[PDB]
Design a protein around this ligand. Structure first.
Ligand code: PC1
Ligand code: PC1
Ligand code: PC1
Ligand code: PC1
Ligand code: PC1
Ligand code: PC1
Ligand code: PC1
Ligand code: SOU
Lengths: 357, 406, 388, 406
C-alpha cells in the first residue's frame, strides 16, 4: 500500500489532483529528454561510445513515456480495480514481495545516480564534465563549467533516473498487488463454497456464484488494464536483452568504452525483473481455478436438493478452464513465455554480434 | 434478394462485373444475356492466363543472373495467387452458393428482434468498411505499380556477345511487367497496347485475389456478429425463466426462446463448417505460394541498400504479401475468440435464480461452447493470428540468418 | 467369417499369402497344410533377411565415398521399414487378432439397422478403395524399379547386393535379378499391406462414428414429449443403451488400434526421420534430369506417401470424434425427457476429448505431424542450400 | 511403520545410510545417536563439497584450451546435480515428510478391500523394480568410471615453458577426476588417498542424485496405482447402484462406497499437489543444468573420431543425462495418462442401467476427472514425455547444425 497509494494518486484515480500534475510534469520531462536524445543522435556529431549510450537513453525514455501514457489512459479501469480491491487485502507473501521490490528500486536508483560521481573520483584519465560523468547523457544546452553548473546538471539528469525507477516500480508492484487481490478473493470464494457444503445452503452457494462472477469481471478488467504494459515489456525486453548483451560482450572485448556497463548492468537488471514478475504471477492465475474445481467435488454433492446439484455442475464446468492472462491475441503470460523470450533474445544477440564484428 | 445475399450484394456485383465464372444472382436469364456473359468471362480468362504465360516465358528465356531469376519468380508467384483463385472460384461456385444461402429463411424471435436488427446493422457496416478498404488498397497498388516503372532505368543484364564472361545492359521496354509478346512491344502501337494490357491485367488480377479474400472475411464477419447477437440475448432469455412473483404460458415462452437460441447457434456452427469446406483449400494454396514468396522476398530484402526502386519494390511486395495473410488471420482469430467467449457470457448471466430448463440450457451451452469454432485451411492449420505470428517469426528469423551467414 | 474379419477379408488373405506369419483365419487346419504354410513362411523370411544382410554387406565393404555411403544408407533404411514390420506383425499377432475380434458379435439396433447398413457398405468401399490405391502404387514401385536401372564395371542389378556367387555373367546374373525382383515386391507388399490394415481400421472407426452421429436425431424424436408412456420409456432406454454400447465399442476399438500399431508407427517415424534427413542432403545434389534426380524424387515421394497415408486418416479420426458433440447438439434435446437430457449431458462431457492415435505416447498421428515433418525437411534443405 | 513409509522403506533406509540430512523414521532417539548421525551427515557434506570445490579449482586454474575447458565444465555440471540435490533435500525435508505421510491413516473400503490389495502390492512390485535398476545403473556407472581411467594416456596439455606458441604434454596422476589437492596426489600415499576419496565421492554423489530421482518416481508410481485402483473399482460401484429387482441397506452401502471413491480421489489430487510442491524446483534446477550439459555435449560429440576414450566418455555422459531426464519424464507422462483416462472409465460402465444416483455420480466424476493431473517443475514446464522429446529434438538439431556448419 506504500507504492500502490502513490500509483493511485499519480494516476488520477483519487480525488487529489496534485499528484496528477506531478505525473504531467514527469511526462513533460520524459518527452523533453526523448527529443533531446533524438536530436543528439541525429543532429549532432558524436562517437560510437556516445551513439550507443544515446541509443540506450532514448530507448529507456521511450519506454518510460509509454508506460506513463499507458497508465494514464486506463484511469477509470484502474479506479474500478481499486474499488474492487478495497474490501479484502492481499496475501502476506505478495506484500513481502512488494516491499522487497520497492526497497530494491530505491537502492538501485540511488546507486545508479551516485555511481557517475565515483567514476569521476576514480580513473584519473577522466575528469568531471565529459561523456560518462553524468547519470544521463549530456544533452543540456549548457556547457561544462565550474562545480556548481556540474552539480545542477547532475541533479537535472538524476531526476530522469528517479522518474524511470518510479515508473518501473509502479508497473512492477501493481501487477503483484492486483493478482494478490484476485487470489485472496478466490480463496474467500472457496471458503464460502466449503461453508455451503455444510448446511445444504443453496442460498450461500448462490452467493458464492455471485462472488465468482464478480471475480471474473474483475479479472477481465485486470486484463484490460495490463494488456499494454505487458506487451511493451515483452517486446522491449527481448530486443533490449539482445542489444545490451551485445554491448556488454563488445565492451568486455574492449571495442567500446567499458563504463557503458554501468547502464547495461543496470538497465537490463530492471528489465529482467519486469518480465519475470509478469510471467511468474501470470502462471499463479492458472492454479486458482483448480481450488474451486477440487472444492466442488465433495460427498455433500450427493445429499443436496437436485437444483443445488445443477449449480454445482455449472460452476464445475466453468472452473475446468484455467484463468489465462492472454494479451495481444497470441501471448499467454506465464513462465513458458519467459522460456520462449530468451531464444529471440539470443537470435538478436547473435545478429548484432556478427554485424558488429 | 434477401438474407446474406442482400448484405453481400456489392461483393457479388463486383464479382459478376470482374469476369469470374458466376451464373446465379442475375435478373436477365435470357439466351442472349447468358451467351454475352459467358463470352465476356471466357475472354477475361483467356487474357488473364495468356498474360500469365507471357510473364512466365519472360522468366526462364531471358533470365541470366540469380537476382533476375529471383525477381521473376517473385512476380510470377505474386500473380499465381490470382491465377489459382480465378480457377478456384470459377469451378467451385457450388460451395460459395451453399455458404451464401445458409441464412436464407431465418427470422429473429420477436423477443430478440431489436438486438438482431442492431447486430445486423453492425455487420453490414463492418462489411462495407472492409469493401472500402479492399478497394482503396487495390487501387493504390495498381497506381503504385504504374508509378514505380517510371523511376528507374529500363535496362536488362544480358551476357556480352563479344567478350567471354562479361555482361552488358540492354535497353528494355518500360512496362509494368517483364513479359514476352508475339508482337514488338518496344515502341509505338505495340508499346501502347502492351502497356494498356498490362495495366488491365494487373488491376483485374488484384481484383480477383482481393474479392476472394474480402468474401471470406465478410463471411467471418457475419458469423462473428451472429455470435455476438447470441451472446447478448442470453440475459433476457434467462430473465424470462425467472420465477419472480412458472405458468404454462411462461414455460412455453421460455422453451421457444431456448429453441430459437439453439437453432441460431447450430446455424452459426454449420455456417462455419460451410466456410471451411468452401474456402479451406484456397487458404492452403495461398499459404503454399506465400511461403516461397516470403522466403525469396527475405532474400531480396537482404540485398537492399539505400533508397531506390529495388528497395521500394521489395518493401511493397513484402507488405502486400503480409497484409493478405493478416486479412484472413485477423478474422479467423476474431471468430475463434467470439466463439470461445460464449461460455463466459452464458456463465455471467443470472442463471442461478432461473428455472430448471434454463439451468439445463446453460449447462449444455457451457459444455459445447468450450471448444472454439475454428476455420481450418484444408485441415492443415487453423486460421488465426497464431498463424500470422508464426509466419512473421519464420520470415524474420530467415532474414536474420541470411544477413548473419552471408 | 463375420464382423471385421469378413469386411477386411482381402487384406487378411493377402497377408496370409504374402509370407507373414498368420495362424488364424484359415479353414484348412490339417497336419499338412499348417506344416507347409509354416515352411513357406520360414523360407520367405529367410529370403528377405538374407537379402537384407547382403545389402548391409555391400553397404560397408564396398562404400568408399560419402555419396555412395549416403545412397547405401538410404536404400538400407528404405527397406528397414519392411524389415521391422515383418517381425512386428509376425511376433505380435495377438494384438491384431484382438483388434479384428473387437467387432465380432456386435449387432445393430432394430430401429437403427438400415442406417448401420448405409455406413457399413460405404466403409467397405473405402476399405477397398485404399486397397486399390496401394495395389497400384506398390505395383508401380515394382515396375518403376525395373525402368530406372537400365537408364544409367558393375553388374546391372536393381539393388547393389553382395552375393556368394558371381552375379556378373551367366545364370548367376539372372538368378540375382529374379531374387531382387521378388524381394523388392515382397518387402513393398508387406510395408504397404501393414499401413493399409491400419488405415482400414481408421476408416471403419470413422464410419461407425458417423453412423452414431446420424442416429442421434431419430433417438431424440423418439424421446420427444410431442403430443411419456411405459413403452416410450422402454424404447428410449433401449436406444440410449444401443447408442452408448456402440460409442464405447468405438472407443475401445480405437484404443485397440492405438495399442496394436502404436510402437510400429514410432519405429517407422524413427527410421523415416533419418531417411528424410539423408534425402534432404542428397536433394542438394541435383544436376538436371538424370538417374540421381529421379531416384531422389522417387524416394521422397514414397517416404512421404507412407507417412501421409496414415496422417490424413488420423486427422480424419480426430475431427470425426470431435464432432459427435455438434451431433448431440443438433438433435432437439430441449423437447426430450429428463433421462434424455442427462444422456445428452454425459455424452457432451465425454465428447470433450477427440480420439487420437498416439505413437507410444510420444506424438499424435495427424496432419499436423505430417506438416511438421515436411517443414523440418524443407527447413533442413534450405539450411543445407544456404550453407553450401 | 505403516502407509507410504513402509512401502518406501528401503529407499528411506538408503537415504539415511547415504549421509543426507534426514532425522525422522528412526527408533533410537537418544542423546548420542542423534549426535552421531549429525556428525556423520556433516562430515559427508564437508567431504562432498570440498571435493566439488577441488574439481572447480582444477577446472579454472589448469584449463588452457577450449577443449579442456569443455571437458572440465561437463564434469562440474554433471556433479552440480548431486550438489544441488543434496543441499535441496537437506534443507527441504519438511515437504518430503509431508508427502510421505499423506497416506497415513487411509484404509480401503471393505467392498474394495480386494482390488486395492491387488494394486497396492503392484505398486510395490514397481517400486522395488525401480530400486533395483537404479541400484545397477549407479553401481555400473561407478565401475565404468573406475575402468575408463586406466584405458588412456593420463597427459595434460600445457603451454611449453621454453618456446612462445607451442604446447606440450605433461604426465598427470591417473585419477578418476581432474582435481586439485593440498597434498601431492602424484604417487604413494597421496595417490592412494586421492583415488579412494574420488571413488567414494563419485559413488556417493551419484547415489545422492539417484535416491532423489527414485523417490520422485516412486511417489508418481504410487499415485498412478491409486488412480488405476479408482478406475477399476468403478464397475462394481456402478453395479451397486443398479436398480435390478434401492433398499436401506443398499442405499447406505452405495453411499459409503461413493464416499470412499470421492475421498480417495481427493487424496490422490492432494498427493499429486504435494509431490509438485516437494519436488518441483528440483526438476527445474535439473533441467537448467542439463540444458547446459547437453549443449556442451552436443558440441563435444562433433569431435568424435573412431573409437577411443573420448568417444566412450561423451557417449556415457549423454546416455546418463538422457536417462536421468527420461526417468522422471516417463512417470510424469504415466500420471498424466492415468489421470486423464478416469473419465473414459467412468463413461464405460453401465450408468444408463443404474439409478439417478449412478448417473449423477458419473456426471460429477466425468466433470471432475477431465483435466489431467500434471506435475510441473515450478510451473516452468510440464513433466511428461513431451519434455523429453522436445529436449532430444533440440539436442539433435543442435548437433546437426554444428556438424553441417563446422
Ligand atoms: C517489436 C519491437 C518493439 C520495440 C519496442 C520499442 C517501443 C515500441 C512501441 C510499441 C511496442 C508495443 C506496444 C504495446 C502495444 C500497444 C498497442 C496495443 O495495445 O496493441 C496491442 C494489440 C492488441 O491489444 P489488446 O490485447 O489490448 O486487445 C485485444 C484484447 N481483446 C481481445 C479483449 C480486445 O496486440 C498487438 O498489437 C500485437 C502485439 C504486437 C506488439 C508486441 C510484439 C511482441 C512480440 C515481440 C517478440 C516476442 C517474443 C516472445 C514471443 C513468444 C510467443 C510467440
Ligand atoms: C512462411 C515463410 C517462412 C520463410 C522461411 C521458410 C523456409 C523455406 C520454406 C520454403 C522453401 C523455399 C523454396 C526455395 C525458394 C528459396 C530459394 C532461395 O531463396 O535461394 C536464393 C536464390 C538466389 O540466391 P543465391 O542462392 O544465388 O545466393 C548466392 C548469391 N550469389 C550467387 C551471388 C553468390 O533464389 C533464387 O534462386 C530464386 C528462387 C528459385 C526458384 C524457387 C522455386 C521454388 C519451388 C517451390 C516448389 C514447392 C515447394 C513447397 C514449399 C512449401 C512446403 C511446405
Ligand atoms: C485501416 C486499414 C488500412 C490500413 C492497413 C492496411 C494498409 C495496406 C497494407 C498493404 C498496402 C500495400 C500496397 C502497396 C504495395 C505494393 C505491392 C507491390 O507489389 O509492390 C511492387 C510493385 C512493383 O514491383 P516491381 O518493381 O517488381 O514491378 C515493376 C517492374 N519493373 C521493375 C520492370 C518496373 O509496386 C511497388 O513497388 C509500389 C511500392 C510502394 C510501397 C511504398 C509503401 C510506403 C513506404 C513503405 C512503408 C515503410 C515502413 C515499412 C518499412 C519496411 C518494414 C518491413
Ligand atoms: C487418390 C489418391 C492419389 C494419391 C495416392 C496415389 C499417388 C501416390 C503418390 C506417391 C507415389 C510414390 C511411388 C513413386 C515413387 C517410387 C518409389 C521409389 O522408391 O523410387 C525410387 C526408385 C529407384 O530408386 P533408386 O534409383 O535409388 O534404386 C535403384 C538403384 N540403382 C539405380 C543402382 C539400380 O524408382 C524411381 O526412381 C521412381 C522415380 C519416378 C518419379 C515419378 C514422379 C516424378 C515427378 C514427381 C513430381 C515432381 C515433384 C513435385 C513435388 C512432389 C509432388 C507434390
Ligand atoms: C536458438 C536457441 C538459442 C537458445 C539460447 C538460450 C539457450 C542457451 C543454452 C545453454 C547455453 C550454454 C552456453 C555454454 C555452451 C556454449 C556452446 C558451446 O559450444 O560451448 C563450447 C565451449 C568451447 O567450445 P567453442 O565454443 O569454443 O566452439 C567453437 C566452435 N563452434 C563455433 C563451431 C561452436 O565450451 C566452453 O566454453 C565451456 C562452457 C562455458 C560456459 C559455461 C556456463 C556455465 C558455467 C558453470 C560452471 C560450473 C558452475 C559451478 C562452478 C562455478 C565456478 C565459477
Ligand atoms: C549452468 C546452469 C547454472 C548453474 C546451476 C544453476 C542451478 C541453481 C543453482 C543454485 C542452486 C539452488 C538450490 C539450492 C537451494 C535449494 C533449497 C531450496 O529451498 O530452494 C528452493 C526454493 C524455492 O522455494 P519452494 O517453495 O519452491 O521450495 C520447494 C520445496 N522445498 C522447500 C522442499 C525445497 O528457493 C530457491 O528457488 C533457491 C534460491 C536460489 C535460486 C537459484 C539462484 C540462481 C538462479 C539460477 C541462475 C541461472 C539462471 C539462468 C537462467 C537462463 C539464463 C540465460
Ligand atoms: C528395463 C530397463 C533397462 C535399463 C534402461 C536404462 C538403461 C541405462 C541408461 C543409462 C546408461 C548409463 C550407463 C553408464 C554411462 C556412464 C556414465 C558416465 O558418466 O559416463 C562418463 C564416464 C567417464 O567420464 P570421464 O571420461 O569424464 O572420466 C574420466 C576422467 N579421465 C579422463 C581423467 C580419466 O564413464 C564412461 O565413459 C562409460 C562409458 C560407457 C561405458 C560402457 C562400458 C565400457 C566400460 C569400459 C570402457 C573401456 C573401453 C574404452 C576404451 C575402448 C578401447 C579403446
Ligand atoms: C525499462 C528499462 O529497462 O529501463 C530501466 C532503466 C534503468 C534501470 C536506469 C534508468 C536510467 C536512465 C533513464 C538513463
Amino acid at each position: 500500500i506504500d507504492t500502490i497509494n502513490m500509483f493511485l494518486q499519480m494516476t488520477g484515480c483519487t480525488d487529489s489532483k496534485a499528484m496528477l500534475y506531478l505525473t504531467y510534469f514527469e511526462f513533460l520531462i520524459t518527452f523533453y529528454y526523448l527529443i533531446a536524445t533524438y536530436a543528439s543522435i541525429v543532429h549532432f556529431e558524436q562517437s560510437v561510445t556516445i551513439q550507443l549510450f544515446a541509443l540506450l537513453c532514448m530507448l529507456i525514455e521511450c519506454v518510460i513515456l509509454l508506460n506513463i501514457t499507458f497508465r494514464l489512459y486506463h484511469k477509470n479501469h484502474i479506479r474500478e480495480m481499486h474499488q474492487y480491491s478495497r474490501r479484502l487485502g492481499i496475501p502476506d507473501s505478495y506484500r513481502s514481495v512488494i516491499n522487497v521490490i520497492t526497497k530494491y528500486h530505491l537502492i538501485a536508483s540511488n546507486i545508479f545516480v551516485v555511481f557517475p560521481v565515483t567514476y569521476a573520483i576514480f580513473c584519473d584519465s577522466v575528469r568531471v564534465g565529459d561523456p560518462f560523468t553524468f547519470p544521463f547523457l549530456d544533452v543540456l544546452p549548457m556547457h561544462t563549467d565550474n562545480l556548481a553548473i556540474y552539480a545542477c546538471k547532475y541533479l537535472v539528469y538524476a531526476i530522469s533516473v528517479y522518474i524511470a525507477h518510479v515508473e518501473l516500480c509502479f508497473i512492477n508492484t501493481t501487477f503483484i498487488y492486483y493478482v494478490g487481490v484476485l487470489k485472496h478473493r478466490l480463496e474467500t470464494i472457496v471458503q464460502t463454497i466449503g461453508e455451503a457444503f455444510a448446511d445444504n445452503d443453496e442460498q450461500k452457494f448462490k452467493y458464492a456464484i455471485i462472488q465468482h462472477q464478480k471475480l471474473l469481471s474483475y479479472f477481465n478488467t485486470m486484463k484490460i488494464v495490463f494488456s499494454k504494459p505487458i506487451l511493451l515489456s515483452m517486446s522491449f525486453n527481448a530486443i533490449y536483452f539482445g542489444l545490451t548483451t551485445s554491448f556488454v560482450i563488445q565492451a568486455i572485448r574492449g571495442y567500446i568504452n567499458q563504463a557503458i556497463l554501468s547502464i547495461c548492468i543496470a538497465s537490463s537488471a530492471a528489465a529482467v525483473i519486469n518480465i519475470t514478475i509478469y510471467t511468474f504471477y501470470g502462471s499463479e492465475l492458472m492454479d486458482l481455478h483448480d481450488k474451486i474445481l477440487h472444492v466442488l467435488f465433495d460427498n455433500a454433492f450427493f445429499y443436496v436438493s437436485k437444483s443445488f446439484k445443477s449449480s454445482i455442475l455449472i460452476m464445475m464446468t466453468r472452473v475446468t478452464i484455467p484463468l489465462k492472462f492472454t494479451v495481444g491475441y497470441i501471448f499467454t503470460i506465464n513462465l513458458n513465455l519467459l522460456l520462449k523470450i530468451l531464444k529471440m533474445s539470443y537470435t538478436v544477440l547473435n545478429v548484432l554480434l556478427s554485424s558488429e564484428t | 434478394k434477401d438474407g446474406l445475399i442482400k448484405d453481400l450484394w456489392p461483393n457479388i456485383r463486383l464479382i459478376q462485373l470482374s469476369g469470374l465464372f458466376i451464373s446465379e444472382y442475375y435478373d436477365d436469364y435470357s439466351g442472349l444475356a447468358v451467351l454475352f456473359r459467358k463470352i465476356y468471362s471466357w475472354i477475361t480468362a483467356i487474357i488473364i492466363y495468356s498474360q500469365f504465360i507471357f510473364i512466365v516465358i519472360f522468366m526462364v528465356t531471358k533470365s541470366n543472373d540469380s537476382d533476375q531469376l529471383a525477381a521473376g519468380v517473385v512476380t510470377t508467384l505474386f500473380f499465381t495467387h490470382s491465377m489459382i483463385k480465378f480457377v478456384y472460384f470459377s469451378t467451385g461456385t457450388k460451395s460459395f452458393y451453399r455458404t451464401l444461402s445458409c441464412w436464407n429463411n431465418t427470422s429473429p424471435h420477436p423477443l430478440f428482434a431489436e438486438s438482431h436488427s442492431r447486430f445486423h446493422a453492425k455487420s453490414l457496416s463492418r462489411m462495407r468498411q472492409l469493401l472500402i478498404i479492399v478497394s482503396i488498397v487495390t487501387i493504390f497498388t495498381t497506381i503504385s505499380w504504374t508509378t514505380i516503372t517510371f523511376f528507374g532505368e529500363s535496362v536488362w543484364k544480358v551476357p556480352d556477345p563479344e567478350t567471354f564472361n562479361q555482361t552488358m545492359y540492354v535497353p528494355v521496354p518500360r512496362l509494368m511487367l517483364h513479359s514476352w509478346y508475339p508482337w514488338d512491344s518496344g515502341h509505338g502501337l505495340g508499346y501502347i497496347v502492351a502497356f494498356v494490357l498490362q495495366f488491365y491485367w494487373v488491376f483485374i488480377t488484384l481484383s480477383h485475389s482481393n474479392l476472394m479474400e474480402l468474401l471470406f472475411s465478410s463471411f467471418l464477419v457475419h458469423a462473428c456478429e451472429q455470435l455476438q447477437h447470441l451472446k447478448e440475448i442470453l440475459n433476457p432469455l434467462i430473465e424470462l425463466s425467472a420465477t419472480l412473483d412458472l405458468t404454462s404460458n411462461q414455460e412455453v415462452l421460455v422453451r421457444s426462446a431456448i429453441k430459437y437460441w439453439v437453432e441460431r447457434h447450430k446455424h452459426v456452427v454449420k455456417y462455419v463448417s460451410l466456410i471451411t469446406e468452401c474456402y479451406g483449400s484456397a487458404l492452403l494454396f495461398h499459404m503454399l505460394v506465400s511461403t516461397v514468396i516470403l522466403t525469396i522476398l527475405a532474400y531480396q530484402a537482404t540485398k537492399i541498400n539505400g533508397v531506390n526502386v529495388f528497395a521500394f519494390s521489395t518493401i511493397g511486395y513484402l507488405m502486400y504479401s503480409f497484409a493478405q495473410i493478416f486479412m484472413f488471420c485477423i478474422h479467423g482469430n476474431e471468430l475463434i475468440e467470439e466463439s470461445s467467449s460464449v461460455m463466459e457470457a452464458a456463465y455471467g448471466c443470472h442463471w442461478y435464480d432461473g428455472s430448471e430448463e434454463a439451468k439445463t440450457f446453460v449447462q449444455i451451452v457451457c459444455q459445447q461452447c468450450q471448444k472454439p469454432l475454428i476455420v481450418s485451411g484444408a485441415k492443415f492449420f487453423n486460421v488465426s493470428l497464431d498463424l500470422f505470428a508464426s509466419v512473421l517469426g519464420a520470415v524474420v528469423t530467415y532474414f536474420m540468418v541470411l544477413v548473419q551467414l552471408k
